[PDB]
Design a protein around this ligand. Structure first.
Ligand SMILES: [Cl-]
Ligand SMILES: [Cl-]
Ligand code: NA
Length: 129
């Protein structure tokens, strides 16, 4: 699924991401924009042979099982394919674990390089939320 901006905002807010670990909704929408362009089916292969999945490009190196990242972990205890679903529940529940592991949203490189320190509230402006 390719979400609209406000559509995604509302889904994330419903799942409790707004202000989760102190990160306002616009941070999460900005991270999704630049990680996946709001597309739940986005996938991208990493240098080390792991793959990032879904709207928040969650990495198989640590967080999900894809069967093709030798030596990896599955800390969210899910198949990576669950992160491609039109229903973002699995991506949000796993992102809450990632953002809690110590480095907050710096876990997402696109958030650090394209959202951190910007007007992230622009990402939810206009939304009836
Ligand atoms: Cl915000
Ligand atoms: Cl933090
Ligand atoms: Na894995």
């Amino acid at each position: 699924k390719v979400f609209g901006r406000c559509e995604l905002a509302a889904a994330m807010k419903r799942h409790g991401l707004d202000n989760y670990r102190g990160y306002s909704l616009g941070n999460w929408v900005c991270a999704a924009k630049f990680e996946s362009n709001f597309n739940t089916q986005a996938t991208n292969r990493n240098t080390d042979g792991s793959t990032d999945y879904g709207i928040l490009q969650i990495n198989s190196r640590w967080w999900c099982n894809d069967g093709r990242t030798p030596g990896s972990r599955n800390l969210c205890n899910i198949p990576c394919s669950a992160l491609l679903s039109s229903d973002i529940t699995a991506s949000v529940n796993c992102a809450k674990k990632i953002v809690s592991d110590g480095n907050g949203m710096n876990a997402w490189v696109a958030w650090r390089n394209r959202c951190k320190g910007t007007d992230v509230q622009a990402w939810i402006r206009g939304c009836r939320l």
